Amino acid sequence: HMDAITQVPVPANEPVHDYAPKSPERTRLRTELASLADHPIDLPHVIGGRHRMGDGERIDVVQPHRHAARLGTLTNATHADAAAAVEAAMSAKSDWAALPFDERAAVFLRAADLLAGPWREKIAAATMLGQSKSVYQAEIDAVCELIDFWRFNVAFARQILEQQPISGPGEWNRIDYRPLDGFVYAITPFNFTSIAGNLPTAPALMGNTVIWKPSITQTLAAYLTMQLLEAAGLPPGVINLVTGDGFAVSDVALADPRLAGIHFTGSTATFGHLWQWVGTNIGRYHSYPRLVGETGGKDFVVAHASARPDVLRTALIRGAFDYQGQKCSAVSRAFIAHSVWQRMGDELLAKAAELRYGDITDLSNYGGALIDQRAFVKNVDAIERAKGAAAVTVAVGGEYDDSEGYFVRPTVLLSDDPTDESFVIEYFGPLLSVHVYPDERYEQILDVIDTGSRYALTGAVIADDRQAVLTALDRLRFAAGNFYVNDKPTGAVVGRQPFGGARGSDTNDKAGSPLNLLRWTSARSIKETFVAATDHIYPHMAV
Amino acid sequence: HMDAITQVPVPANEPVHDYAPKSPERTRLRTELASLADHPIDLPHVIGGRHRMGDGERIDVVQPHRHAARLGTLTNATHADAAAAVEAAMSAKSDWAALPFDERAAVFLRAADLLAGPWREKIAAATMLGQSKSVYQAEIDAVCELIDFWRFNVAFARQILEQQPISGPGEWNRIDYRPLDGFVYAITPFNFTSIAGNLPTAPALMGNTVIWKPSITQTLAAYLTMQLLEAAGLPPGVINLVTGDGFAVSDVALADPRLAGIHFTGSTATFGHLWQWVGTNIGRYHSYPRLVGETGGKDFVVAHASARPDVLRTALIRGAFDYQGQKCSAVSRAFIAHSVWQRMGDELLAKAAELRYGDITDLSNYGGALIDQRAFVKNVDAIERAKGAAAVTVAVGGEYDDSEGYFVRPTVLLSDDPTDESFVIEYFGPLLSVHVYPDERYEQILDVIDTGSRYALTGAVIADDRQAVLTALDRLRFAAGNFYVNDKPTGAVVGRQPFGGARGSDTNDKAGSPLNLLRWTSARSIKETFVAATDHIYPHMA
Ligand code: B12
Ligand code: B12
């Protein structure tokens, strides 16, 4: 037993290592890079703690910047593999939910310290190699953000647990944060090793069990993430990894009456498809399935006449070209005051021209390749559509070559008129559209942005002038979900920029605050009355 | 302007007046009962501040316990009325959302004090007459719970506004809790004047505008709630009241691209139907509609051998027969240890036989009538089913008569085998089923309750024995939302028993905690960087 009201350790953001030359973390990284690249492995399903290749199609996972180089081979989950994954989750449920919160949380605090130290460069490396991330992009994702999700989620959970009610005289009211009945299906994207780790573990912390279907191109890091959790003491069957395209896994998972919920990422249309499925089929489920996730988007930057040019320039380059524009959203549209364009236009383009994309094992590169052949094709199409469109010049970039890796150069489009949002969402890649507007039209450009922005997760204003900043904060209040003043608009740091979403979204329960964790619990109130009534009659009834 | 970081008043639960003989409130209540009873009124739509009857069918609102006695007449909203309610909500948005939080909050704090004082017995009486509540049932709902929702929601909202993030070095991070874009559609049931007032006001607090469709049989108190709100200063068009059956209003609201959300009550099938509609048609909405609600259900009590017999008896009587069994949930099944039944069975039956249901203007009655003819038929069918079924005996009650009011007597059924949940959910009414179990089969019975209960909102254990209590808290952990020890399982007091829901439901965002108000906001993070980078190159690159 235990007689205590315990505290969890206090989280803080994990520091980002730089991997500068001569640094020890850089030497460690090269060891890990060579080790993963030179020793490709089977990437098996992990079900009830057993690692097994299955009977489905074998699919290679390769380095996107060098696609002839194999990192591993997975088998596409069959229906049978998925049914086994589910049975394993249901079978581990009882022992996992009975562990006290403090002991489930130690698993993830431990996993976090393991990722911060001895696993750090292995997980960074795996993310670099599979997902074509520069070391800095791997470090802010697979190390830091994943570490922070675990440590802050443990703190968020613990805070949820002490949210208790008032007891009136003669009674005692308490609240019990129950885990869900049934299993949770986590489907994770290629873009972040952190999201891939978090979507399955967050519900797990609150006492649930999980089946987890990672994106094929992220599966090296996902499998390693699974080994890390096992080394931290995650029990068998609490999370069950199934590799592949996910088709057979969804057939099975969505037909099972024990589906408690789905933690995923996707478009508005994906959400509506799932709503439609679950609403139509609601009588088939024991519980009402919970559908918790976030979308992608494309973002914008507006520079006022007071914008600092070098700040603006650097925000556009990073915002648009960090990770080859493949974050959950990237900067696709810049609106730049004419006088500020005269000062930094040429520098933007020259630097964009010099910006090196190549093999990420060469640490001098800024970034790597696009994630796969389908992504490449989408970019090529968007470039060809721009070369032949009226409005648009290709001012720099637009070259591409899939012979060695899925390489697309940084590309700046100049549009004579405000760039239409519908074009920029058809791909994810290093393509930035710029529209130069007359300084005195700042307010009109803000209205144009507002009126033509349905798909931005984030926006930024660059301006030293306070009225200009405030006017943007007012006028674009609903045009994006996270807003930035004098920096690139980008991925949040955990605990710092929670929430957001594109216009009209309902996704404030996504990862990054306690609201996510709540979705993985079902609270009940318990009341005890000490001396209840012994007569049913009420004072109003007396003669 | 304003330079301040203000606090709101600290909410405490509103005290329940007893209305004892010779009490001042009882006199004031009789005054208000007569005024409403003797002076029936038109019950109009309230659109953009304008109180107007429409061209739809005329529908009388009557006293359910005296259905010859009209309280008012409403007009079934047409599509045109519904479209106008929507445009009015959209026209009022801009000025409402631009009011500072404190000024929006003050409207609901003021309405709370008005309801506590000058409007108190008027709103209670309206609820007594139209919904057929005893004075105590009106008081805990129409007065106290509704006041508590307003005062507690204001404090919850203010608490949300101060949840703010960490700023690291060189930056400032903040969070802005924006109202939604577009309108919120609130649809409210007959059972509670409190829910009916809260569902439309809660999102409004957060800066939204609303159309509200109340239940027909609750429209008297709804219209008077609307007036109380206008008298607290609610601006025109912020909440727009459309009366009737909802059909046309749902047609218009659901077809409008500006639908931001629906705040309602309903069954799992209703949620599923709305989910299917919104998902299938999601491409037509500017925002993803938010569907926020709760369900009803039917509850149980289990008595261990160690139960206090009088506590159980009272809990059973109140839990099943308070408001004629017509709360969101009511106690429909009791599982009683044989030795405790020997001790309070006869007394339960006798007290239920003597229990008086009648015209609630006679304050000596325990309760009134069922809400409408539809409800009454469902009860009759359930009583005749029970009589016909071999499993079940009618131990007391079972009489019914709709000639003057929709009256059904407290009824107790004796089931030789554990009573099946599917039977109890096809009516709301004063029908309690008792199954007597052998003392030593306590754990077996807890298992049968667990296995057989999917529709309980609440459950209770009556037992002085601590192991027995704890065994119930563990074994029935998932069998019900809110769980009660040595008391009747019923509706929460605000801030005391939040959350709950039936097995496997997903409604912790329902009214009664801050989570509900968050559903009516869209939070964004704002970050300002003071000295951002001027070179894009990274240290790893050297
Ligand atoms: C919804 C859906 C679509 C949607 C997705 C977006 C939307 N909702 O508007 C759309 C219409 C675009 C689509 C298109 C097609 N899909 Co489809 N679709 C699905 C469905 C019914 C559910 C997917 C889902 O939302 N899963 C939940 C999300 C959260 O998980 P996810 O892993 O992120 O899912 C993504 C992928 O499934 C991807 N996707 C969907 N379909 C296809 C097909 C292929 C070949 C690929 C590579 C990817 C892909 O889209 C999802 C959203 O990003 C499945 C059924 C199933 N068993 O998976 C099929 C299914 C995957 N689709 C299929 C087919 C055949 C198609 C099409 C070839 C023809 C068509 N128009 O339906 C194209 C191919 C698209 C492509 N990328 O090459 C087949 C594939 C059979 C196989 N290869 O084994 C499936 C299994 C249906 C079936 N059994 O017949 N599909
Ligand atoms: C879903 C639905 C049903 C469902 C509801 C529960 C469920 N999901 O299983 C079911 C299948 C039970 C149903 C039954 C019927 N309903 Co129907 N149904 C609806 C619908 C499509 C949506 C209602 C809703 O979910 N609203 C949202 C909720 C949150 O608001 P609510 O006010 O609490 O809604 C309640 C009422 O609408 C009630 N209800 C539903 N239908 C009917 C019909 C009548 C006459 C009454 C009095 C009540 C009622 O059920 C809802 C949930 O409790 C509407 C369309 C519309 N424009 O309203 C029709 C609609 C109201 N129904 C109608 C009809 C014809 C029927 C039936 C006569 C025949 C049938 N089976 O289709 C029966 C009558 C039942 C009765 N009580 O007398 C017509 C009424 C036309 C008119 N009189 O002007 C409508 C307008 C259109 C239609 N048929 O598609 N219905």
Describe the strand order of the beta sheet including B45-47 as a list of residue ranges.
B50-52, B45-47, B239-241, B210-213, B183-187, B259-265, B290-294
Which of A341, A206, A208, A213 is CA-nearest to residue A266? A213
Chain A residue closest in CA terms to B135: A540
Between CA A429 and CA A407 the distance in angstroms is 10
The domain ranges of chain B are 1-295+494-542, 296-493
Q: Which of B170, B525, B524, B532 is nearest to A464 (CA)?
A: B532
Structure tokens at B423: 């039977």
CA distance A55 to chain B (A): 35
Residue A206 DSSP code: T
Angle at CA of residue A397, ends A396 and A403, nearest 5° = 165
What residues 168-197 of chain A have any CB closer than 8 A to a CB of chain B? 168, 171, 173, 175-176, 178, 181-182
Between CA B528 and CA B369 the distance in angstroms is 62
Taking a C-beta distance cutoff of 8 angstroms, is the pair B303, B336 a contact? Answer: yes
Q: Are B290 and B183 in contact (CB under 8 A)?
A: no
Q: What is the CA radius of gyration of chain B?
A: 25
How many angstroms separate the CA atoms of B418 and B452, rounded?
Answer: 9
Structure letter (DSSP) for residue B56: S
Q: Going by C-beta distance under 8 Å and a sequence separation of 6 or more, which residues neighbour residue B458?
A: B299, B329, B480, B481, B482, B483, B484, B489, B490, B500
- 3-state SS, residue B361: coil
Which pair of tokens denotes residue A244? 């592949």
Q: Domain B1-295+494-542 falls in which CATH fold?
A: Aldehyde Dehydrogenase; Chain A, domain 1 (3.40.605)
A247: contact with B, CB 8 A cutoff: no
Q: What are phi and psi of B283, to 5 degrees?
A: -65, -15
The Cα angle at residue A390 between residues A389 and A392, in degrees rounded to 5: 70
Q: Is B317 in contact with A487 (Cβ distance < 8 A)?
A: no
Q: Give just the sign of the alpha carbon dihedral A147, A148, A151, A154.
A: negative
**Strand order across the A66-75 sheet:** A41-43, A66-75, A58-63
Contact present, A404 and A368 (Cβ < 8 Å):
no
> How far away is chain B from the Cα of A426, in angstroms, using its nearest Cα?
17
Asked if A314's CB is within 8 angstroms of B532's CB, the reply is yes
User: Is the distance from CB of A507 to CB of A268 less than 8 angstroms?
Assistant: no
Cβ separation of B166 and A286 shorter than 8 Å?
A: no
For residues A20 and A393, what is the distance between their CA atoms, to the nearest angstrom?
Answer: 38
- 3-class DSSP state of B55: coil
- Name which residue sits closest to atom 59 of ligand 2, judged by CA: B247
- Best mutation target among B525, B528, B535 (most A Cβ atoms within 10 Å) is B525
Residue with tokens 């801050």, as numbered in its chain: B514
- In whole angstroms, give the CA distance from residue A192 to residue A142: 7
Q: Measuring CA to CA, which residue among A291, A261, A275, A271 is closest to residue B273?
A: A275
Tell whether B388 lies on the interface with A, counting CB pairs under 8 A. no
A329-337 and A297-303 beta bridge pairing: parallel
> What HEC string does A145-161 produce?
HHHHHHHHHHHHHHHHH
For chain B, positions 281-320, list CB contacts with chain A under 8 A. 281-283, 285-290, 308, 310-311, 313-315, 317-318
| CB distance A273 to ligand 1 below 6 Å | yes
Choice from A215, A216, A250, A371 to test ligand 1 binding pocket (greatest atom count within 8 A of CB): A250
Ligand 1 neighbour A264 (Cβ under 6 A): yes
Please choose, from the candidates B431, B362, B367, the residue with its C-alpha nearest in 3D space to the C-alpha of residue B138: B367
The reply to whether ligand 1 has any atom less than 6 angstroms from the CB of A254 is: no
Which candidate from B260, B480, B532 shows the least CB-CB separation from A486?
Answer: B532
Q: Backbone phi, then psi, for A185, in 5-degree steps?
A: -110, 115
Q: Which two tokens stand for residue A61?
A: 């996972």
B93 is in an annotated binding site: no
Q: Does B497 touch chain A (CB under 8 A)?
A: yes
**Cβ proximity of A150 and A109 under 8 Å:** yes
What gap in Å lies between CA B514 and CA A508, rounded to an integer? 14
> Residue A216 half-sphere exposure, CB side, CA atoms within 13 Å?
20
Whether A268 and B279 lie within 8 Å, measured CB to CB = no
**B328 marked ligand binding residue:** yes
For B384-407, the DSSP string reads HHHHH-TTEEEEE---EE-SSS-E
Name every chain B residue with its beta carbon within 8 A of the beta carbon of A312.
Answer: none
CA distance B329 to B295: 9
Please give the helix or strand (H or E) that residue A247 lies within, else none.
helix A247-255
Residues 6+ apart with CB under 8 A from B255: none
Reference A130, options A211, A222, A53; nearest CA is A222
Specify the DSSP class assigned to residue A66.
E
For this entry, resolution in Å reads 2.3
In this structure, the number of other CB atoms found within 10 A of the CB of residue B161 comes to: 17
Catalytic residues of A: 294, 328
Handedness of CA B43, B49, B53, B54 (dihedral sign): negative
Kindly state the tokens that stand for B106.
Answer: 């003050």
A119 sits in which H/E element:
none
Radius of gyration of chain A (CA): 25
CA-closest candidate to residue B257, choices B275, B282, B238, B239: B282
Residue list, annotated binding site of A for Mg(2+): 386-387, 389, 392
Nearest Cα neighbor of A47 from A249, A344, A220, A215 is A249
Which strand ranges, in their side-by-side order, compose the sheet holding B41-43? B41-43, B66-75, B58-63
Answer whether B272 sits within 8 Å of A280, measured CB to CB. yes
- Pairing label, strands A45-47, A50-52: antiparallel
C-alpha distances out from residue B29 to A198, B43, B114, B123, B190, Å: 58, 22, 16, 10, 21
The half-sphere exposure of B498 on its side-chain side, counting CA atoms within 13 A, is: 26
Catalytic residue status for B25: no
Hey, how many other C-beta atoms are within 10 angstroms of the C-beta on B527? 25
Give the length of chain A.
543
Report how far residue B454's alpha carbon sits from residue B424's, in angstroms, rounded to the nearest whole number.
Answer: 12
| Tokens linked to A19 | 């991997």
Location of structure tokens 């830091």: A144
Dist. CA B289–CA A268, nearest whole Å: 12
Bridge partners (DSSP) of residue B42 are B73
Give the integer Cα–Cα distance in Å for B199 and B511: 8
> How many whole angstroms from B259 Cα to the centroid of ligand 1?
29
Within 10 A of A392 (CB to CB), how many other CB atoms are there? 18
Among A166, A282, A363, beta carbon nearest to B541: A363
A532 C-beta neighbours (distance < 10 Å), count: 21
Calpha distance A456→A346 (Å, rounded) = 27
The CATH topology of domain A1-295+494-543 is Aldehyde Dehydrogenase; Chain A, domain 1 (3.40.605)
Token pair 């519908």: residue: A422
B79, B217, B250, best to mutate for ligand 2 pocket (most atoms within 8 Å of CB): B250
Q: Which residues of chain B neighbour A508 with C-beta distances below 8 Å?
A: 518, 521-523
Residue A274 is which amino acid? L
**Alpha-carbon span A245 to A62, nearest angstrom:** 16
SS3 A323: helix
Q: How many residues does chain B have?
A: 542
Can you tell me the distance from the alpha carbon of B85 to that of B81, in angstroms, rounded to the nearest whole number? 6
Looking up tokens 């948005």 gives B93
Q: Order of strands across the sheet with A259-265?
A: A50-52, A45-47, A239-241, A210-213, A183-187, A259-265, A290-294
Q: CA-CA distance, A325 to B324, in Å (whole number)?
A: 63
By 3-state DSSP, what share of chain B in percent is helix, strand and coil, each rounded to 5?
Answer: 40, 20, 35
> β-strand B171-179 against B521-529: which pairing, if any?
antiparallel
Backbone angles phi, psi at A240, to 5 degrees: -130, 115
Catalytic position from the list B14, B139, B145, B328? B328
CA separation, residue B381 to residues A474, B93, B376, B443 (Å): 60, 47, 9, 33
Tokens encoding A240: 């069950």
How distant is the alpha carbon of residue A76 from its chain centre? 23
Interface residue A353 vs chain B (CB under 8 A): no
Tell which phi-psi region holds residue B279, choosing left (phi > 0), alpha (psi between -120 and 50) or beta: alpha
- The span from the CA of B373 to the CA of A291, in Å, is 39
Q: Residue A488: CB partners within 8 Å, gap ≥ 6?
A: A301, A314, A315, A316, A318, A319, A331, A460, B532
β-pair partners for A301:
A334, A460
**Ligand closest to CA B373:** 2
Q: Which two tokens stand for residue A99?
A: 């562990």
Instruction: Tell me the C-alpha to C-alpha distance, in Å, between residue B203 and each of A94, A466, B199.
Output: 39, 32, 7
What's at A193, amino acid-wise?
Answer: T
Which of A509, A455, A466 is closest to A333 using CA atoms? Answer: A455
Q: Is the CB of A187 under 6 A from ligand 1?
A: yes
Nearest-by-CA chain B residue for A363: B541
**Phi, psi angles (nearest 5°) of residue B72:** 180, 180
Q: Are A416 and A438 in contact (CB under 8 A)?
A: no
For the domain A296-493, what is the CATH code? Answer: 3.40.309.10
How far apart CA A449 and CA B446 sit, in angstroms, is 61
Ligand 2 centroid to residue A482 C-alpha, Å: 41
Cross-strand bridge partners of residue B465: none
